[PDB]
Design a binder for these strands. Structure first.
Ligand SMILES: [Mg+2]
Ligand code: NA
Ligand code: NA
Length: 327
DNA sequence: CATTAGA
DNA sequence: TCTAATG
């Protein structure tokens, strides 16, 4: 956690660069298990060799370790850190809709800067076009102060359209968070569950509504179960307009809300931990259900859930408000 | 790890 | 269809 820091840090730096600049999923996958193990290790790694004893720890990495322990640096990292080619791939990648694959290609053609991207908007698809458009806004955190007004809005329209719609703003904002990165609205409807052959309109009706009023300004992607857009709060009585914010709304078979709900609310650790527990407690939990476990090794049989509670009760635990789902 | 764009 | 990019 702090004893093997630099080591794992230098480790993940390296990996990352494999997978990103180079297309070496392998090496990258290397740096990572290593980084993974050294991470667990209970003692100050003193040299390559000590490290070396580890599983995943070959001579290659063990060797970086020495150089790093000897000199507080690393050439390869000093070298990658310099390399514009590589620096470029790192950056372009920040544009929403631009993965590595494309970052490389762009770079190839010679799109390295934000401006390059500009003079060449043509080479970019819708997503990237928008991603490039709202570059500054996407990078900004969402103050809860606004998180609230946004949540407010969405809530309203949903209701206005069908009264039977249930929506929850999941994520860290759900958990208290002072700021958030984007908005995650989970959604369902009675009329839609595990069997009932869809109702695409269900997602659609709502999107349209949000748009109608001008909350949603664009679309990154809209399918029959997951809409991925951009919104903005009515820019008041001027002098102050709002930043464009990423939004996602997904449809859910009412028969799986709460789990999904549970889940998306995190946190990553709270989840896992709860998760590990349901286990002992004789269960299983995934992004959609909670299955009683059986002796033969494994088992099925989706237990019925009406609220976050049920999940709780099942594995017999103390209902933890989102506030404290911290870990 | 599953959902969408695209080509 | 496969393959990329989000989450
Ligand atoms: Mg994005
Ligand atoms: Na080893
Ligand atoms: Na990106």
């Amino acid at each position: 956690e702090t004893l093997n820091g630099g080591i794992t840090d230098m480790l993940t730096e390296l990996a990352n660069f494999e997978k990103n600049v180079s297309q070496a999923i392998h090496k990258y996958n290397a740096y990572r298990k290593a980084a993974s193990v050294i991470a667990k290790y209970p003692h100050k790694i003193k040299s390559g060799a000590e490290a070396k004893k580890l599983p995943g720890v070959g001579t290659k990495i063990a060797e970086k370790i020495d150089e790093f322990l000897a000199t507080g640096k690393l050439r390869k990292l000093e070298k990658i850190r310099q390399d514009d080619t590589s620096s470029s791939i790192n950056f372009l990648t920040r544009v929403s809709g631009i993965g590595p694959s494309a970052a490389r290609k762009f770079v190839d053609e010679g799109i390295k800067t934000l401006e390059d991207l500009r003079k060449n908007e043509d080479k970019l698809n819708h997503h990237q076009r928008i991603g490039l458009k709202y570059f500054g806004d996407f990078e900004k955190r969402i103050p809860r102060e606004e998180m609230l007004q946004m949540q407010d809005i969405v809530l309203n329209e949903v209701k206005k359209v069908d009264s039977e719609y249930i929506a929850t703003v999941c994520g860290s904002f759900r958990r208290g968070a002072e700021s958030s990165g984007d908005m995650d609205v989970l959604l369902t409807h009675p009329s839609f569950t595990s069997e009932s052959t869809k109702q695409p309109k269900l997602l659609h009706q709502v999107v349209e509504q949000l748009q109608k009023v001008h909350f949603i300004t664009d679309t990154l992607s809209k399918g029959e179960t997951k809409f991925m857009g951009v919104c903005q709060l009515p820019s008041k009585n001027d002098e102050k307009e709002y930043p464009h914010r990423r939004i996602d709304i997904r449809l859910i078979p009412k028969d799986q809300y709460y789990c999904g709900v549970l889940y998306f609310t995190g946190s990553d650790i709270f989840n896992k931990n709860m998760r590990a527990h349901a286990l002992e407690k004789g269960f299983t939990i995934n992004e959609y259900t909670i299955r009683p476990l059986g002796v033969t090794g494994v088992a099925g049989e989706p237990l019925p859930v009406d609220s976050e509670k049920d999940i709780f009760d099942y594995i017999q635990w103390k209902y933890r408000e989102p506030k404290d789902r911290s870990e």
